[PDB]
PDB file of C-alpha atoms and ligand atoms in Angstrom:
ATOM      1  CA  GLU A   1       5.667 -37.699  -7.393  1.00 44.19           C
ATOM      2  CA  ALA A   2       3.141 -36.508  -5.150  1.00 41.68           C
ATOM      3  CA  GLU A   3       5.338 -34.777  -2.731  1.00 40.70           C
ATOM      4  CA  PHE A   4       2.986 -31.316  -2.170  1.00 40.95           C
ATOM      5  CA  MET A   5      -0.274 -32.963  -2.026  1.00 42.75           C
ATOM      6  CA  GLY A   6      -2.326 -33.893   1.347  1.00 42.17           C
ATOM      7  CA  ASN A   7      -1.361 -30.292   2.568  1.00 41.26           C
ATOM      8  CA  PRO A   8      -4.036 -29.301   5.728  1.00 41.83           C
ATOM      9  CA  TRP A   9      -2.738 -25.514   5.113  1.00 43.43           C
ATOM     10  CA  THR A  10      -3.601 -24.984   1.715  1.00 40.56           C
ATOM     11  CA  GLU A  11      -7.047 -23.048   2.172  1.00 38.73           C
ATOM     12  CA  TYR A  12      -5.795 -20.943   5.453  1.00 38.19           C
ATOM     13  CA  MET A  13      -2.622 -19.802   3.346  1.00 38.99           C
ATOM     14  CA  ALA A  14      -4.558 -18.360   0.215  1.00 39.02           C
ATOM     15  CA  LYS A  15      -4.198 -15.316   1.770  1.00 39.94           C
ATOM     16  CA  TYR A  16      -0.186 -15.656   2.136  1.00 41.89           C
ATOM     17  CA  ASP A  17       0.740 -15.896  -2.240  1.00 40.62           C
ATOM     18  CA  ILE A  18       0.804 -12.442  -2.195  1.00 41.08           C
ATOM     19  CA  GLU A  19       1.569 -12.468  -5.948  1.00 41.27           C
ATOM     20  CA  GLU A  20      -1.966 -14.500  -6.004  1.00 42.43           C
ATOM     21  CA  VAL A  21      -4.237 -12.334  -3.848  1.00 45.81           C
ATOM     22  CA  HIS A  22      -2.664  -8.120  -4.068  1.00 43.16           C
ATOM     23  CA  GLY A  23      -1.182  -8.741  -7.526  1.00 46.45           C
ATOM     24  CA  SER A  24       0.852  -5.616  -8.157  1.00 47.21           C
ATOM     25  CA  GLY A  25       3.316  -3.751  -5.744  1.00 45.86           C
ATOM     26  CA  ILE A  26       3.252  -2.730  -2.201  1.00 44.82           C
ATOM     27  CA  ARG A  27       6.342  -0.251  -1.242  1.00 46.05           C
ATOM     28  CA  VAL A  28       5.690   1.497  -4.575  1.00 45.11           C
ATOM     29  CA  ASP A  29       1.740   0.220  -6.269  1.00 43.82           C
ATOM     30  CA  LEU A  30       1.878   1.890  -9.913  1.00 44.68           C
ATOM     31  CA  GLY A  31       0.601  -1.892 -11.392  1.00 49.13           C
ATOM     32  CA  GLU A  32      -2.519  -0.286 -14.109  1.00 48.05           C
ATOM     33  CA  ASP A  33      -1.991   2.382 -16.714  1.00 48.33           C
ATOM     34  CA  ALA A  34      -5.591   4.832 -17.275  1.00 46.25           C
ATOM     35  CA  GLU A  35      -6.069   7.119 -20.119  1.00 45.36           C
ATOM     36  CA  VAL A  36      -6.641  10.489 -19.060  1.00 45.89           C
ATOM     37  CA  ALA A  37      -7.674  13.399 -22.321  1.00 46.43           C
ATOM     38  CA  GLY A  38      -5.783  10.520 -24.611  1.00 47.72           C
ATOM     39  CA  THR A  39      -2.351  10.372 -21.904  1.00 46.73           C
ATOM     40  CA  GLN A  40      -1.682   7.361 -19.961  1.00 46.20           C
ATOM     41  CA  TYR A  41      -0.881   7.745 -16.252  1.00 45.71           C
ATOM     42  CA  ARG A  42       0.397   4.973 -14.142  1.00 49.21           C
ATOM     43  CA  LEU A  43      -2.066   4.267 -11.195  1.00 45.26           C
ATOM     44  CA  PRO A  44      -2.461   1.929  -7.687  1.00 43.82           C
ATOM     45  CA  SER A  45      -3.869  -1.341  -9.148  1.00 40.83           C
ATOM     46  CA  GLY A  46      -3.370  -3.890  -6.052  1.00 36.68           C
ATOM     47  CA  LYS A  47      -6.038  -5.767  -4.489  1.00 36.64           C
ATOM     48  CA  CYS A  48      -5.345  -6.211  -0.615  1.00 37.57           C
ATOM     49  CA  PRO A  49      -5.403  -3.254   1.145  1.00 36.95           C
ATOM     50  CA  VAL A  50      -1.901  -1.887   2.825  1.00 36.74           C
ATOM     51  CA  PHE A  51      -1.833  -1.788   6.799  1.00 37.77           C
ATOM     52  CA  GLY A  52       0.246   0.736   8.491  1.00 35.23           C
ATOM     53  CA  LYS A  53       1.826   2.932   4.692  1.00 36.98           C
ATOM     54  CA  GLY A  54       2.057   6.808   4.734  1.00 41.21           C
ATOM     55  CA  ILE A  55       3.852   8.957   2.684  1.00 39.70           C
ATOM     56  CA  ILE A  56       6.972  10.939   4.337  1.00 38.34           C
ATOM     57  CA  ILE A  57       7.252  14.208   2.357  1.00 37.91           C
ATOM     58  CA  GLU A  58      10.470  15.850   2.709  1.00 35.59           C
ATOM     59  CA  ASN A  59      11.022  14.878   6.702  1.00 35.07           C
ATOM     60  CA  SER A  60       7.750  15.625   7.891  1.00 35.31           C
ATOM     61  CA  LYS A  61       5.710  12.510   8.359  1.00 37.20           C
ATOM     62  CA  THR A  62       2.530  14.659   9.518  1.00 40.06           C
ATOM     63  CA  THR A  63       1.867  16.145   5.998  1.00 36.65           C
ATOM     64  CA  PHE A  64       0.961  13.562   3.185  1.00 38.17           C
ATOM     65  CA  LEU A  65      -3.151  13.783   4.347  1.00 35.55           C
ATOM     66  CA  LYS A  66      -3.174  17.578   4.084  1.00 39.03           C
ATOM     67  CA  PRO A  67      -4.694  18.689   0.785  1.00 39.53           C
ATOM     68  CA  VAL A  68      -2.520  19.895  -2.385  1.00 38.29           C
ATOM     69  CA  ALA A  69      -1.722  23.635  -3.386  1.00 37.50           C
ATOM     70  CA  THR A  70      -3.455  25.195  -5.481  1.00 36.64           C
ATOM     71  CA  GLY A  71      -2.668  28.716  -6.964  1.00 35.23           C
ATOM     72  CA  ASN A  72      -1.623  30.999  -4.277  1.00 33.79           C
ATOM     73  CA  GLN A  73      -0.392  28.518  -1.915  1.00 32.01           C
ATOM     74  CA  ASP A  74       3.250  26.934  -2.233  1.00 33.54           C
ATOM     75  CA  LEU A  75       3.333  23.386  -3.551  1.00 33.54           C
ATOM     76  CA  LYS A  76       6.208  22.607  -0.661  1.00 33.49           C
ATOM     77  CA  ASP A  77       3.330  23.174   1.964  1.00 31.08           C
ATOM     78  CA  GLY A  78       0.459  21.207   1.123  1.00 31.81           C
ATOM     79  CA  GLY A  79       0.515  17.115   1.095  1.00 30.81           C
ATOM     80  CA  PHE A  80      -1.656  14.646  -1.529  1.00 27.76           C
ATOM     81  CA  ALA A  81      -4.979  14.820  -0.482  1.00 25.36           C
ATOM     82  CA  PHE A  82      -7.984  16.190  -2.342  1.00 23.55           C
ATOM     83  CA  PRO A  83      -8.348  19.889  -2.361  1.00 26.57           C
ATOM     84  CA  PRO A  84     -11.393  20.873  -0.817  1.00 29.97           C
ATOM     85  CA  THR A  85     -14.900  20.721  -3.690  1.00 31.46           C
ATOM     86  CA  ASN A  86     -18.289  21.611  -3.503  1.00 31.55           C
ATOM     87  CA  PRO A  87     -19.356  19.570  -2.057  1.00 30.26           C
ATOM     88  CA  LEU A  88     -17.155  18.730   0.090  1.00 29.58           C
ATOM     89  CA  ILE A  89     -16.547  14.878  -0.564  1.00 27.41           C
ATOM     90  CA  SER A  90     -12.967  14.453   0.227  1.00 27.33           C
ATOM     91  CA  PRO A  91     -12.058  14.190   3.897  1.00 28.37           C
ATOM     92  CA  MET A  92     -15.018  11.956   4.677  1.00 27.89           C
ATOM     93  CA  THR A  93     -16.398  10.135   7.915  1.00 27.74           C
ATOM     94  CA  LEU A  94     -17.379   6.344   7.702  1.00 24.54           C
ATOM     95  CA  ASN A  95     -20.883   7.489   8.733  1.00 24.50           C
ATOM     96  CA  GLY A  96     -20.862  10.000   6.062  1.00 25.27           C
ATOM     97  CA  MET A  97     -20.138   7.266   3.427  1.00 23.66           C
ATOM     98  CA  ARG A  98     -22.827   5.233   4.385  1.00 22.71           C
ATOM     99  CA  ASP A  99     -25.344   8.156   3.837  1.00 23.36           C
ATOM    100  CA  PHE A 100     -23.910   9.175   1.122  1.00 23.06           C
ATOM    101  CA  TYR A 101     -24.299   5.653  -0.923  1.00 24.38           C
ATOM    102  CA  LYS A 102     -27.625   4.939   1.512  1.00 23.65           C
ATOM    103  CA  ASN A 103     -29.263   4.219  -2.277  1.00 21.18           C
ATOM    104  CA  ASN A 104     -26.803   1.378  -3.250  1.00 17.92           C
ATOM    105  CA  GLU A 105     -27.578  -1.543  -1.746  1.00 16.40           C
ATOM    106  CA  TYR A 106     -24.281  -3.202  -2.168  1.00 21.88           C
ATOM    107  CA  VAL A 107     -22.173   0.218  -1.555  1.00 25.54           C
ATOM    108  CA  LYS A 108     -23.744   0.984   1.857  1.00 23.09           C
ATOM    109  CA  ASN A 109     -23.411  -2.369   3.543  1.00 23.16           C
ATOM    110  CA  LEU A 110     -19.321  -2.808   2.607  1.00 25.66           C
ATOM    111  CA  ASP A 111     -17.010  -3.085   5.226  1.00 25.06           C
ATOM    112  CA  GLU A 112     -14.709   0.259   6.159  1.00 25.81           C
ATOM    113  CA  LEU A 113     -11.908  -0.236   3.606  1.00 25.03           C
ATOM    114  CA  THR A 114     -13.808  -1.549   0.430  1.00 24.23           C
ATOM    115  CA  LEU A 115     -16.168   1.549   0.915  1.00 25.01           C
ATOM    116  CA  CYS A 116     -13.124   4.128   1.172  1.00 26.16           C
ATOM    117  CA  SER A 117     -11.823   2.444  -2.356  1.00 25.90           C
ATOM    118  CA  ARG A 118     -15.166   2.925  -4.214  1.00 20.48           C
ATOM    119  CA  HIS A 119     -15.614   6.316  -2.302  1.00 19.32           C
ATOM    120  CA  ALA A 120     -11.873   7.517  -3.719  1.00 17.58           C
ATOM    121  CA  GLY A 121     -12.999   5.285  -7.178  1.00 18.30           C
ATOM    122  CA  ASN A 122     -16.814   7.630  -7.926  1.00 17.35           C
ATOM    123  CA  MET A 123     -15.440  10.899  -7.386  1.00 15.70           C
ATOM    124  CA  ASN A 124     -13.716  13.086 -10.437  1.00 12.85           C
ATOM    125  CA  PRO A 125     -14.076  16.643  -9.743  1.00 13.68           C
ATOM    126  CA  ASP A 126     -11.700  17.601 -13.013  1.00 10.87           C
ATOM    127  CA  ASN A 127     -14.869  15.920 -14.964  1.00 11.20           C
ATOM    128  CA  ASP A 128     -13.235  13.324 -17.298  1.00  9.87           C
ATOM    129  CA  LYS A 129     -16.576  11.467 -17.702  1.00  9.76           C
ATOM    130  CA  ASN A 130     -15.338   8.476 -20.084  1.00  8.16           C
ATOM    131  CA  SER A 131     -12.715   7.301 -18.090  1.00  4.97           C
ATOM    132  CA  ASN A 132     -10.833   4.728 -16.218  1.00  4.44           C
ATOM    133  CA  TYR A 133      -8.733   6.701 -13.807  1.00  3.13           C
ATOM    134  CA  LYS A 134      -8.982   6.207 -10.088  1.00  2.00           C
ATOM    135  CA  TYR A 135      -7.572   7.685  -7.133  1.00  2.00           C
ATOM    136  CA  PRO A 136      -6.018   5.668  -4.544  1.00  2.00           C
ATOM    137  CA  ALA A 137      -7.306   6.438  -0.964  1.00  2.00           C
ATOM    138  CA  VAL A 138      -6.008   6.550   2.673  1.00  2.00           C
ATOM    139  CA  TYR A 139      -8.789   4.973   5.463  1.00  2.00           C
ATOM    140  CA  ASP A 140      -7.253   6.574   9.195  1.00  2.00           C
ATOM    141  CA  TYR A 141      -9.288   4.275  11.680  1.00  2.00           C
ATOM    142  CA  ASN A 142      -8.197   7.177  14.747  1.00  2.00           C
ATOM    143  CA  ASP A 143     -11.066   9.264  13.508  1.00  2.00           C
ATOM    144  CA  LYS A 144     -12.971   6.977  11.038  1.00  2.00           C
ATOM    145  CA  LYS A 145     -12.185   9.053   8.458  1.00  2.00           C
ATOM    146  CA  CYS A 146     -11.690   8.338   3.905  1.00  2.00           C
ATOM    147  CA  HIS A 147      -9.049  10.472   2.576  1.00  2.00           C
ATOM    148  CA  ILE A 148      -9.046  10.292  -1.261  1.00  2.00           C
ATOM    149  CA  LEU A 149      -5.444  11.003  -2.603  1.00  2.00           C
ATOM    150  CA  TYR A 150      -5.198  13.683  -5.380  1.00  2.00           C
ATOM    151  CA  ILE A 151      -1.311  12.743  -6.031  1.00  2.00           C
ATOM    152  CA  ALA A 152      -1.080   8.432  -6.843  1.00  2.00           C
ATOM    153  CA  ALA A 153       2.702   8.930  -6.879  1.00  3.87           C
ATOM    154  CA  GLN A 154       4.154   7.286  -3.814  1.00  2.00           C
ATOM    155  CA  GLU A 155       8.708   8.135  -4.185  1.00  2.00           C
ATOM    156  CA  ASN A 156      10.638  10.490  -5.640  1.00  2.00           C
ATOM    157  CA  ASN A 157      13.547  10.410  -3.804  1.00  2.00           C
ATOM    158  CA  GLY A 158      16.625  10.162  -6.290  1.00  2.00           C
ATOM    159  CA  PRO A 159      20.093  11.455  -5.210  1.00  2.00           C
ATOM    160  CA  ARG A 160      20.514  14.084  -8.500  1.00  2.00           C
ATOM    161  CA  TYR A 161      17.661  16.652  -6.945  1.00  2.00           C
ATOM    162  CA  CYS A 162      17.154  14.871  -3.453  1.00  2.00           C
ATOM    163  CA  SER A 171      14.610  23.032  -5.882  1.00  2.00           C
ATOM    164  CA  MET A 172      12.160  19.590  -6.277  1.00  2.00           C
ATOM    165  CA  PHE A 173       9.439  17.969  -3.783  1.00  2.00           C
ATOM    166  CA  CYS A 174      11.065  14.951  -2.207  1.00  2.00           C
ATOM    167  CA  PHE A 175       9.074  11.762  -0.686  1.00  2.00           C
ATOM    168  CA  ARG A 176       9.117   8.326   0.133  1.00  2.00           C
ATOM    169  CA  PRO A 177       6.589   5.051   1.318  1.00  2.00           C
ATOM    170  CA  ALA A 178       7.116   3.622   4.597  1.00  2.00           C
ATOM    171  CA  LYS A 179       5.534   2.036   7.567  1.00  2.00           C
ATOM    172  CA  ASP A 180       6.074   4.561  10.790  1.00  2.00           C
ATOM    173  CA  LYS A 181       4.453   4.962  14.438  1.00  2.00           C
ATOM    174  CA  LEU A 182       2.501   7.877  12.991  1.00  2.00           C
ATOM    175  CA  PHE A 183       1.102   6.267  10.144  1.00  2.00           C
ATOM    176  CA  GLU A 184      -0.132   2.718  12.205  1.00  2.00           C
ATOM    177  CA  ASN A 185      -3.907   3.986  12.009  1.00  2.00           C
ATOM    178  CA  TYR A 186      -3.698   4.378   8.002  1.00  2.00           C
ATOM    179  CA  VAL A 187      -4.619   2.057   5.261  1.00  2.00           C
ATOM    180  CA  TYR A 188      -3.384   2.544   1.576  1.00  2.00           C
ATOM    181  CA  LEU A 189      -6.037   1.485  -0.669  1.00  2.00           C
ATOM    182  CA  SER A 190      -6.286   1.227  -4.274  1.00  2.00           C
ATOM    183  CA  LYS A 191      -9.024   1.546  -6.640  1.00  2.00           C
ATOM    184  CA  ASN A 192      -9.041  -2.776  -7.364  1.00  2.00           C
ATOM    185  CA  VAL A 193      -9.424  -3.101  -3.145  1.00  2.00           C
ATOM    186  CA  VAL A 194     -11.684  -6.276  -2.864  1.00  2.00           C
ATOM    187  CA  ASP A 195     -15.101  -6.683  -0.929  1.00  2.00           C
ATOM    188  CA  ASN A 196     -13.287  -9.735   0.533  1.00  2.00           C
ATOM    189  CA  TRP A 197      -9.883  -8.825   1.789  1.00  2.00           C
ATOM    190  CA  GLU A 198     -10.690 -10.057   5.353  1.00  2.00           C
ATOM    191  CA  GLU A 199     -10.214 -13.413   4.415  1.00  2.00           C
ATOM    192  CA  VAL A 200      -8.004 -13.608   1.329  1.00  2.00           C
ATOM    193  CA  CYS A 201      -5.955 -10.853   2.139  1.00  2.00           C
ATOM    194  CA  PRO A 202      -2.572 -10.656   5.517  1.00  2.00           C
ATOM    195  CA  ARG A 203      -3.548  -8.611   8.022  1.00  2.00           C
ATOM    196  CA  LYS A 204      -2.579  -9.295  11.319  1.00  2.00           C
ATOM    197  CA  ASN A 205       0.737 -10.866  12.800  1.00  2.00           C
ATOM    198  CA  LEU A 206       0.807 -14.518  13.530  1.00  2.00           C
ATOM    199  CA  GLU A 207       2.395 -15.282  17.199  1.00  2.00           C
ATOM    200  CA  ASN A 208       4.268 -18.607  18.117  1.00  2.00           C
ATOM    201  CA  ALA A 209       4.471 -19.114  14.305  1.00  2.00           C
ATOM    202  CA  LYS A 210       6.788 -19.400  11.170  1.00  2.00           C
ATOM    203  CA  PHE A 211       6.362 -19.332   7.263  1.00  2.00           C
ATOM    204  CA  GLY A 212       7.245 -22.717   5.718  1.00  2.00           C
ATOM    205  CA  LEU A 213       7.281 -24.459   2.832  1.00  2.00           C
ATOM    206  CA  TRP A 214       4.894 -28.252   2.546  1.00  2.00           C
ATOM    207  CA  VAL A 215       6.934 -30.814   1.090  1.00  2.00           C
ATOM    208  CA  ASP A 216       6.149 -35.119   1.665  1.00  2.00           C
ATOM    209  CA  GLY A 217       4.208 -34.883   4.942  1.00  2.00           C
ATOM    210  CA  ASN A 218       6.268 -32.107   6.842  1.00  2.00           C
ATOM    211  CA  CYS A 219       6.036 -27.661   7.063  1.00  2.00           C
ATOM    212  CA  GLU A 220      10.083 -27.410   6.418  1.00  2.00           C
ATOM    213  CA  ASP A 221      11.619 -24.483   7.166  1.00  2.00           C
ATOM    214  CA  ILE A 222      12.343 -21.754   4.668  1.00  2.00           C
ATOM    215  CA  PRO A 223      15.332 -23.090   3.004  1.00  2.00           C
ATOM    216  CA  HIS A 224      17.117 -19.657   2.092  1.00  2.00           C
ATOM    217  CA  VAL A 225      16.340 -16.730   4.228  1.00  2.00           C
ATOM    218  CA  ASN A 226      18.376 -13.194   4.335  1.00  2.00           C
ATOM    219  CA  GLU A 227      19.124 -12.025   7.536  1.00  2.00           C
ATOM    220  CA  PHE A 228      18.452  -8.819   9.150  1.00  2.00           C
ATOM    221  CA  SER A 229      18.756  -7.462  12.629  1.00  2.00           C
ATOM    222  CA  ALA A 230      15.505  -5.478  14.150  1.00  2.00           C
ATOM    223  CA  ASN A 231      14.768  -4.297  17.836  1.00  2.00           C
ATOM    224  CA  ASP A 232      11.140  -5.671  17.589  1.00  2.00           C
ATOM    225  CA  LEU A 233       8.351  -7.003  15.515  1.00  2.00           C
ATOM    226  CA  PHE A 234       8.068  -3.282  14.688  1.00  2.00           C
ATOM    227  CA  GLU A 235      11.433  -2.507  13.088  1.00  2.00           C
ATOM    228  CA  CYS A 236      10.906  -6.181  11.218  1.00  2.00           C
ATOM    229  CA  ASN A 237       7.913  -5.304   9.145  1.00  2.00           C
ATOM    230  CA  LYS A 238       9.427  -2.010   8.658  1.00  2.00           C
ATOM    231  CA  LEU A 239      12.165  -3.991   6.439  1.00  2.00           C
ATOM    232  CA  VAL A 240       9.989  -6.236   5.353  1.00  2.00           C
ATOM    233  CA  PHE A 241       8.044  -3.170   3.411  1.00  2.00           C
ATOM    234  CA  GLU A 242      11.288  -1.350   2.181  1.00  2.00           C
ATOM    235  CA  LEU A 243      11.878  -4.691   0.713  1.00  2.00           C
ATOM    236  CA  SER A 244       9.092  -5.704  -0.757  1.00  2.00           C
ATOM    237  CA  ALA A 245       7.382  -5.758  -4.551  1.00  2.00           C
ATOM    238  CA  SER A 246       7.732  -2.499  -6.025  1.00  2.00           C
ATOM    239  CA  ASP A 247       6.143  -0.933  -9.288  1.00  2.00           C
ATOM    240  CA  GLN A 248       9.061   1.998  -9.236  1.00  2.00           C
ATOM    241  CA  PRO A 249      10.835   2.670 -12.209  1.00  2.00           C
ATOM    242  CA  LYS A 250      15.096   2.567 -11.794  1.00  2.00           C
ATOM    243  CA  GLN A 251      15.818   5.887 -13.264  1.00  2.00           C
ATOM    244  CA  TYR A 252      13.542   8.151 -13.394  1.00  2.00           C
ATOM    245  CA  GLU A 253      14.745  11.435 -12.403  1.00  2.00           C
ATOM    246  CA  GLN A 254      16.041  11.626 -15.575  1.00  2.00           C
ATOM    247  CA  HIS A 255      12.280  11.775 -17.331  1.00  2.47           C
ATOM    248  CA  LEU A 256      11.384  14.289 -14.729  1.00  7.75           C
ATOM    249  CA  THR A 257      10.204  17.508 -16.081  1.00  5.81           C
ATOM    250  CA  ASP A 258      11.794  21.020 -14.897  1.00  6.56           C
ATOM    251  CA  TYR A 259      10.280  22.184 -11.232  1.00  5.90           C
ATOM    252  CA  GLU A 260       8.822  26.013 -12.483  1.00  7.26           C
ATOM    253  CA  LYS A 261       6.848  23.991 -15.279  1.00  6.41           C
ATOM    254  CA  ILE A 262       5.639  21.414 -11.792  1.00  7.30           C
ATOM    255  CA  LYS A 263       4.988  24.428  -9.869  1.00  7.24           C
ATOM    256  CA  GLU A 264       2.725  26.182 -11.839  1.00  5.92           C
ATOM    257  CA  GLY A 265       0.856  23.001 -12.713  1.00  7.68           C
ATOM    258  CA  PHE A 266      -0.185  24.064  -9.310  1.00  5.27           C
ATOM    259  CA  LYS A 267      -2.054  26.381 -10.680  1.00  5.59           C
ATOM    260  CA  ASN A 268      -5.120  23.716 -11.049  1.00  5.55           C
ATOM    261  CA  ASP A 272      -2.653  16.770 -15.219  1.00  8.19           C
ATOM    262  CA  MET A 273       0.202  18.760 -15.359  1.00  5.20           C
ATOM    263  CA  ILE A 274      -0.308  17.576 -11.050  1.00  8.52           C
ATOM    264  CA  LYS A 275      -1.425  13.282 -11.957  1.00  4.90           C
ATOM    265  CA  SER A 276       1.737  13.705 -14.410  1.00  5.56           C
ATOM    266  CA  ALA A 277       4.456  15.974 -12.445  1.00  7.61           C
ATOM    267  CA  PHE A 278       6.382  12.934 -10.567  1.00  5.79           C
ATOM    268  CA  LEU A 279       5.084   9.557 -13.205  1.00  3.78           C
ATOM    269  CA  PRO A 280       6.788  10.725 -16.545  1.00  2.30           C
ATOM    270  CA  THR A 281       5.851   8.717 -19.827  1.00  4.86           C
ATOM    271  CA  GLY A 282       9.325   8.305 -20.876  1.00  7.51           C
ATOM    272  CA  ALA A 283      10.505   6.000 -17.001  1.00  6.28           C
ATOM    273  CA  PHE A 284       7.137   4.003 -17.701  1.00  6.09           C
ATOM    274  CA  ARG A 288       8.767  -3.246 -17.638  1.00  5.63           C
ATOM    275  CA  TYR A 289       8.951  -1.956 -14.149  1.00  5.38           C
ATOM    276  CA  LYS A 290       5.877  -3.749 -12.643  1.00  2.00           C
ATOM    277  CA  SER A 291       6.166  -5.998 -10.093  1.00  2.00           C
ATOM    278  CA  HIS A 292       2.839  -8.337 -10.482  1.00  2.00           C
ATOM    279  CA  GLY A 293       3.142  -8.824  -6.955  1.00  2.00           C
ATOM    280  CA  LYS A 294       6.618 -10.514  -6.710  1.00  2.00           C
ATOM    281  CA  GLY A 295       9.094  -9.779  -4.265  1.00  2.00           C
ATOM    282  CA  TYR A 296      10.835  -9.680  -1.149  1.00  2.00           C
ATOM    283  CA  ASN A 297       7.317  -9.669   0.990  1.00  2.66           C
ATOM    284  CA  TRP A 298       7.365 -12.325   3.366  1.00  2.00           C
ATOM    285  CA  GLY A 299       9.405 -12.035   7.217  1.00  2.00           C
ATOM    286  CA  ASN A 300       9.944 -14.827   9.822  1.00  2.00           C
ATOM    287  CA  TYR A 301      11.202 -12.511  13.359  1.00  2.00           C
ATOM    288  CA  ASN A 302      12.679 -14.613  15.699  1.00  3.80           C
ATOM    289  CA  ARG A 303      12.093 -12.326  18.710  1.00  5.20           C
ATOM    290  CA  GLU A 304      15.009 -14.068  20.590  1.00  2.00           C
ATOM    291  CA  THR A 305      17.528 -13.465  18.703  1.00  4.73           C
ATOM    292  CA  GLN A 306      16.048 -10.597  16.905  1.00  2.00           C
ATOM    293  CA  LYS A 307      16.352 -11.423  13.798  1.00  2.00           C
ATOM    294  CA  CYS A 308      14.078 -10.527  10.937  1.00  2.00           C
ATOM    295  CA  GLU A 309      14.364 -13.940   8.095  1.00  2.00           C
ATOM    296  CA  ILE A 310      13.310 -11.825   5.141  1.00  2.00           C
ATOM    297  CA  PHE A 311      12.301 -14.428   1.364  1.00  2.00           C
ATOM    298  CA  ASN A 312      10.732 -14.032  -2.096  1.00  2.00           C
ATOM    299  CA  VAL A 313       8.902 -17.624  -2.211  1.00  2.00           C
ATOM    300  CA  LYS A 314       5.291 -18.023  -1.353  1.00  2.00           C
ATOM    301  CA  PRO A 315       4.839 -19.646   2.353  1.00  2.00           C
ATOM    302  CA  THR A 316       2.411 -23.094   1.834  1.00  2.00           C
ATOM    303  CA  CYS A 317       2.253 -23.936   5.286  1.00  2.00           C
ATOM    304  CA  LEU A 318       3.205 -22.228   9.348  1.00  2.00           C
ATOM    305  CA  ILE A 319       5.923 -24.321  11.929  1.00  2.00           C
ATOM    306  CA  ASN A 320       4.393 -23.464  15.744  1.00  2.00           C
ATOM    307  CA  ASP A 321       7.863 -22.219  17.068  1.00  2.00           C
ATOM    308  CA  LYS A 322       7.168 -19.348  20.670  1.00  2.00           C
ATOM    309  CA  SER A 323      10.979 -17.671  19.458  1.00  2.00           C
ATOM    310  CA  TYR A 324       8.539 -16.582  16.496  1.00  2.00           C
ATOM    311  CA  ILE A 325       5.895 -14.312  14.420  1.00  2.00           C
ATOM    312  CA  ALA A 326       5.273 -14.106  10.989  1.00  2.00           C
ATOM    313  CA  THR A 327       4.447 -10.887   9.021  1.00  2.00           C
ATOM    314  CA  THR A 328       4.136  -9.240   5.514  1.00  2.00           C
ATOM    315  CA  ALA A 329       4.430  -6.097   3.472  1.00  2.00           C
ATOM    316  CA  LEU A 330       0.920  -5.967   3.686  1.00  2.00           C
ATOM    317  CA  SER A 331       0.565  -6.773   7.246  1.00  2.00           C
ATOM    318  CA  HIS A 332       0.051  -4.081  10.596  1.00  2.00           C
ATOM    319  CA  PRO A 333       3.490  -3.118  11.880  1.00  2.00           C
ATOM    320  CA  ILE A 334       1.896  -3.739  15.665  1.00  2.00           C
ATOM    321  CA  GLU A 335      -1.341  -5.910  15.625  1.00  2.00           C
ATOM    322  CA  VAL A 336      -0.986  -9.493  16.108  1.00  2.00           C
ATOM    323  CA  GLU A 337      -3.316 -12.164  15.869  1.00  2.00           C
ATOM    324  CA  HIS A 338      -2.629 -14.434  19.493  1.00  2.00           C
ATOM    325  CA  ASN A 339      -4.845 -17.883  19.377  1.00  2.00           C
ATOM    326  CA  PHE A 340      -2.977 -20.578  16.974  1.00  2.00           C
TER     327      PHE A 340
HETATM  328 CL1   CL B   1     -19.162   1.817  13.254  1.00  2.00          CL
HETATM  329 CL1   CL B   2     -20.138  11.497  10.918  1.00  2.00          CL
END
């Protein structure tokens, strides 16, 4: 009757219950609605940071943190970031943000990731004051910069079009120092969310005094940990609908959108949006470094198994960083 009692891993493993702690899509996060000028738009709402996530645009991995196009610029030239503002509030460094919120005792003492999320949640340049729409952000650890994203869309890569602006989310070496941040990133993510890969360990299920192996896994070959993390991210919880290209409007009207609402509704049509993951998906992977197998599964793990052949990763986890001790 009590097969699941007496688990020594309960508090340790709370951060790997991704459905509980994150609660939205990982690959594509569009878990909430928000009204802007009496019109619903989808936006990111996941509670954990996504380490290593960026958006590849038109086969380019150096583009999406560039500002969006405005007026005379072509749409394909720009990226997803906030355009220049007065005052210039994006990009902003960690020290810039600490100074900017220095009279808010809560916000000024936040960690870098939560501070970037809250900064992005405060700034609304279009000036819909009474509105719950809050932009997502990307923090760059290399130069300690918070970039607010004007475009909350994450995937537009279907077989019909892709004159159309095409893009997809991915883990990639050029995205290693990025962190994708929704408006809901919690201030205690260090305690309750995954970050580092667990060396000499694999995920299991606690059953009757024993940490048993995951009974059914989907085996994908992978040359290293990076490629295993990349595959887990591709299979992870996703809020993107099936048939979205039908509901996309004409691209001439979208281009006219980028002469300064039509930008924010460009690749997120109402007809497409049922499709919310709520964090459910193939979010975890046991990487055997000896057999070069990424063992991917969709049930929450409830313990770890010590094994020197393995590294335990999740779709939220950083693709490189490993926690050595165990
Ligand atoms: Cl610092
Ligand atoms: Cl500075």
